[model samples]
Each structure stands twice: as C-alpha cells, then as structure tokens.
Target: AVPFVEDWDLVQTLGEGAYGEVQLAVNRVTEEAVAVKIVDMKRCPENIKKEICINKMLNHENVVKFYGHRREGNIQYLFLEYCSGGELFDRIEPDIGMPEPDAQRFFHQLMAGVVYLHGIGITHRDIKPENLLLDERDNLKISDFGLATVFRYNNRERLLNKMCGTLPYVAPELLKRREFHAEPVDVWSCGIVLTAMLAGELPWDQPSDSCQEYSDWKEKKTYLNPWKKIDSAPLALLHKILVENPSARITIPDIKKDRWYNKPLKKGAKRP
Candidate 1:
C-alpha cells in the first residue's frame, strides 16, 4: 500500500539524527497529529529496516504506535504516534530529582513496556530517558528502535554480541566485548534510567572499572551523590537491577513484585 504524503500537512520538525529527521504532521482528513520519520532511501542505514520491522510488530499502550510507512521518490516516511509532552529526559532536573510519585509512575510505565517487549523475545537494546517520549497526558511511550533486535524465536533463545546502546545506560557485560543475553542488558539500562529519574543524574558515566563512579558502586560505596540521594526503598531495588552479573540481575517479574515498583500513587494526583 502506498502512503500519500500529501494526505498530511507537515507541521514542524521534531528532531534529526544521522539517518534522517522526524517531523510533526497533521492528517488532512482526520486532522490527527503524527510524527513522521523521514529518511533518504539512498542514505538509509541497514538498521533503519530493522527498526521499521520491529516497530511494526509492536502494539502496546506504552510503545510509540506505528501508523504506517510511505515512500516518495528517494525519501521514506514512517508515520508514528505524536507525543506532545516531549522527551522524558526533559522532565528531569539535575541534582534535584522529581517527586517520588512521579518517578514511580514513569518507572512503572517504562517497566511495563520492557516487560511487553521481553515477552515477545524483542529486546530494546537501548533504554534511556532521551529515547522515552511522553504524550499530552504524560504517559510514557518507548520509542527509537534503531538498535532493537529479537533474541528468541519458537522457544529457542540466542545471545547477542553486537556492542550497541548509549554509554551511561549500557550494561557492563556489553563493554566486555563478549556475547551477552539481551534481557539483562535492558534490565541494567532500566536501572540507570530509574536512577536518572530519581536522582536527576546518572549513577556513573559508564558501568566499567575504569570509571571511578562505577568502581565505587562495585565497591559498595553507598555514600555517593546519586545513591545518597535515592531513598532506601528504591535503592534496594536498584541494587538488584544493576547487578554486575547479568545472571543475578533482577527480572521483570521480580521487579513487578517489588514494593517500590508497585507503590500506589497519591489520590487526586495526575501525570508523572
């Protein structure tokens, strides 16, 4: 099926990346707003195809909805759900973290998305605040599947070796330059993202021995900036999720069972 770009009026440019740019567009008929990722076919990266394939397969409340795709000449347009609240990263303030209820809500939504993806054998491979978008209601939506991949099929599983994802959120095993299970890496990244939401800063530059912050964490130095700032309840959960050993890392089920993860939001309070 061909998607006619003329059917929607381009509003404004949302953002740009190496591969292409995303723009806000309004449907001419329904007047619905959408974000369209526009890429030059000639300059499109091989991973863009993978991104499109994975996004098309995903259908979840916490995931950015993929409307459809269209090609006009050498340009490819990927219609996506428009998130007006902007990036989750912008919600965080350095040094002074957001309220506990707000942090909890965002974390819960993020985990919900992660659990759904893992259930279908797809790993985001990259989970950070910048990649998370929020709609008008402040509901978190996971976006940017450029590095996502499937590690399981038909009850069989395989390890992923490619070193991808951002530095601060990447699991330590990924930096070891060896094969690693995809699920745990996302768990580790989620822990980092939670830390960012609660502490307003990453725990460390990267989870490696060379990084002093990570080294301190490995040494169990709890009296640090971010860790010191986090409350005991969430801190306990962070310890489990950010384990150096991927095998020992906390799973989604266990996280769901944690008290902090299931904390009740205050009555009359809305949006996180």
Candidate 2:
C-alpha cells in the first residue's frame, strides 16, 4: 500500500481492534507520542459519532484515556492512551491461566473500574478480557468503550436490547429478552473473566449452540466438576456473577464485600 495521505509520522503498529488498527505515532507538529485508532469510514458515520459522544462524557482512572478522534483522508482516527503493556486476556496462557493471586488482583481492579462506571450511569456492555489492557505498572485498565451505554442505578429501566457484546459474557437477562439491568450484567462478565483467569476456561460445562443452550450449561455448571476445577474462592465469586436470575445477580456492593476480592485475594492466602 502506498501512502496517499500521511498525517502523523508512524512509529509502530500498536494493536489491531475490531473497528480499527491503532498505531503509535508522533504528532508531526507537537512531536508528542500517541496511539491513533484508525477507523475505516466504510464502517458507518453514526456509529462513530455514537462512540465519540459516549467517550466524551466519561472520565475515570482505570478506564482508557481518550484524546479525541481525528480525520485523515477517508479514515477517522481515535487518538487514545497508547498502552504498551499489551492485552489482558490475550497474554494469558490458554491452558495454564495466570497465577490465582495475579488473576484475583486483576479482578479486584476490574470491579473497581466497573464500580466507577456504574457511578456515572454507564456500563461497559462489552466486558471481555480482550478489551482489558495493562499500563506501565502492569495494573489493569478497562479500554474499548465502543459498546458501552447508559446504566440506570435506581430506575432499572435501561434495557440493552442491541443483541451486542460477546456471547460468553452475556447476562442471563440480556440473552433471555427479559428486562435488562446494569451492574449485574457487568458483574456477570466479570465472573466470566475471573473464571477464565483462574481455570483457563469458560465455566460452562456443555457444548451447545445459542445463548440459551449456553445458559443451560451454566445452570448445570459447578465448581465440583472435573479437576474439582479451581478453588472455592473464584467459584464463590463466579456464583455471584453467573446467577440465573438477573435480579439476584451480584451487585456492586455485594462484590465489595467479597473477602477474597476486598484486599487482594492473595494478600494473606497461600498461592493456588
């Protein structure tokens, strides 16, 4: 490919995402370094504005820093925090998973990030491990705000029916066409991520098509199966996230009380 319209001096290919490819580049004018999320205009303009509108309204420590988007020829770019630490779940070994303590540490941090999102009437609809990133300190950060939307704290009226987000982390209610809820949905995904971190697998025990089939598998899943599969710590937390009843699913405050999650699951406990 020939360079038709060059804006920033490209330094390195930072990462590739579903919407666009990000590159670490130096601003030709300011000489400041930043990651440019290059979105293909072919994807749709309204979707891009929806993303920008949502992002402009959010600010949090654990969330990715948005430096606004720009235009370069036919592509729209999302200038953002250039995370060099790499993707959170992508880096995890499939069969081995991260050490329980390290994984727990990530979960607690994720919960904190979600809790912050809840505070601002927002929810990270797509709460998968891939969207998670690590910063210079190796601390976790919640990135990729494309699928997020408003989450009502008291109204319980916001129902996300877009049929969006990752299937594995889909909340029972979101999949069932039932009325939707916010914190619970995120908690469910957090549970999925946690279980993956600990056991290096999805908690669902059956092979089946469709969300309902997966839901059924989740209903039958338990921590006592093959391998006795992971410690009771994560299972307990997973139980909170994977509840069949959306209303009864884990709430933010409920997670805040989790002993294993409160002060770092491995702070005093032995490494699993």
TM-score of each: 0.94, 0.83
lDDT of 2: 0.73
lDDT of 1 by residue, 236-271 (tens): 999999999999898989999998887776455444
lDDT of every predicted structure (CA atoms): 0.90, 0.73
Model 1 clash pairs are none
How well is each residue in 58-166 modelled by candidate 2, as lDDT tens digits? 7777788887877777798887776778788875677667888798778878988888888878888888888898887767889877777776746564666666678
Candidate number of the best TM-score: 1
Candidate 2 has what TM-score? 0.83
The regions of model 2 sitting more than 4 angstroms off are 1-8, 27-32, 153-157, 205-227, 263-272
Candidate 2: give its CA RMSD in angstroms.
5.4
